[PDB]
Design a protein around this ligand. Sequence first.
Ligand code: NA
Length: 58
Amino acid sequence: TLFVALYDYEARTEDDLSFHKGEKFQILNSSEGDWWEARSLTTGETGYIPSNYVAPVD
Ligand code: NA
């Protein structure tokens, strides 16, 4: 399942990932917690994203 960003997000450190509303991601790990390691389908960049900022694609 692919996820889409609901809002813009600016990373605070090297470990999280900045993104724009509407950006899509593949999810790598989702069972450490509510922050998921993800890969942008736009840039190929990877990093942690807050799961409350994304929703599963239609
Ligand atoms: Na979500």
